[PDB]
Amino acid sequence: IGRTCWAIAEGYIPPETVCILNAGDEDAHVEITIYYSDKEPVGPYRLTVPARRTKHVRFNDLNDPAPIPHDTDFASVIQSNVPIVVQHT
Amino acid sequence: IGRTCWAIAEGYIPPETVCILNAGDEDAHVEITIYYSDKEPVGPYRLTVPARRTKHVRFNDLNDPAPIPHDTDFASVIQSNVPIVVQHT
Amino acid sequence: IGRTCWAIAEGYIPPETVCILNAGDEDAHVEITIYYSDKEPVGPYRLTVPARRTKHVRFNDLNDPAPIPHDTDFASVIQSNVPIVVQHT
Amino acid sequence: IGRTCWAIAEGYIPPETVCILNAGDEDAHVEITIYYSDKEPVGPYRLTVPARRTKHVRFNDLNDPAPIPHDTDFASVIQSNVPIVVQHT
């Protein structure tokens, strides 16, 4: 159930959440990359979504490799080793 | 018309509806599974969507195998033996 | 550009518009069928979307084979002989 | 990541933005065509989205071959030589 690559063309943290579902039996090793209008992309931000669980990820909580600056439009690519379902809220 | 597997990565019942269309000539035997961030999934919740009809299903009305707790973020996978069209409202 | 079959699982006329784009060089002969929770589907409602034009269709304006009753949830299937792009507003 | 052809069946400038992401390593040479209910399409409007960057394009800022009239419903087709991701805001 789902796909191993998702993209979100607009993101913004005011001066921002992806709901992920891994309905499968293997843990999802997820890698997020943040894109900008005027600089190189930052990432991967790495996290695990456990087998048969949801996980909400707040863009504001991401910090490794670096925090996402606030008041800045960005886009994001989310890649997983196993199919997941992503909804941007 | 439609697909036999649909996923909804974010659901919530405040302390929540899927509109299903079976445009086909066979009844749809539908199975919903609810996923959580911190426990195993619950289901299948089973229902029939008749040939050439819509059916609205309220998540709050589901009760077999168990009611969905309120004030709790969940996701859902909806599977059918025949193609259906699902919209989350 | 687009597809020849589109479905909209929830529609409602209070007691409702599809924006269609035919980016192609042939006229689109479109057929809409309305589905209900408790009776057989009604249609086809037939219309033409000209080559390289948009057309907005209000569900409230449809009348042949019959008007859609108000205050009634419905779904719709839109079929075309040529690819079109449909957005429900 | 993404597709080389995107369509947006409803656009309107009051008397309107596409967020584009090129997550790839080649620049995206993008061509927008505007469609109307009652006249021939206008375009291509041409722009470049750089490798590994986002770009927001305001429909109100487009002017070559011609400005889009205000208070007028339109649709748009966006074509690229390389896959991009488009979100209409």
TrEMBL record, chains A, B, C, D:
Domain of life, per UniProt, equals Bacteria
What is the protein name given in its UniProt record?
A: Alr3166 protein
Taxonomic classification, please? Bacteria, Bacillati, Cyanobacteriota, Cyanophyceae, Nostocales
Shown part of the complete sequence: 5 to 105 of 125
